Subunit: 117 residues, 2 copies
Amino acid sequence: DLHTLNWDLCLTQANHKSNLALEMLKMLLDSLPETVEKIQTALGQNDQATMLSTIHKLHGASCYCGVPTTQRLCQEIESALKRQTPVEDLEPEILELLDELTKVESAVKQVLSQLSA
Amino acid sequence: DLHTLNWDLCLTQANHKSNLALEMLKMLLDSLPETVEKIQTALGQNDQATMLSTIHKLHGASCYCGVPTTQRLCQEIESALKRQTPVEDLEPEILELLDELTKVESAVKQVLSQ
């Protein structure tokens, strides 16, 4: 599913150096379980600042890991939080994002089982 | 100091694409407090398995982040773990690494401001 993870886009983003690209994917994967927990907790706690900070860092990453749906969802959520829409009103997009991160974790773990030396 | 962080080095490791290199530094910086905690906790617990995976992952990152001292210490620790050198005997190199990572954090925050 290229909407979830697109290796060729990740290659493009990383200037056709499969080296950096796979390393970026490694760094994203290591960071994802903590990101997911922070998002889940901020949603339950209605914690505006924590949600923003963590979405912002994920957004940064997504621009270089060939994850189009993640990138879009982070953009909508971050922009909205920066306008002070409360976390509560973003529940649909945040829930959609969490579901997407589960698919991204699987997709990256698959692309690393396939291509990592 | 350029033995701690060298931006030009990050650029060579990144084939001269700036925004790529910049994002890699952000990913490294964000990972540091937890990685330091993982290294520290594994030292205290003589957890050679967690030490190896954690050092291995930091080492992979350091190779694209122009951080010469960090990279070398990771190589020394990883090599020695792979020869079954006790984690406890690598206390000096581990403490040097924790020391160096504080300096890396300061340096990266500085470069990211520019």
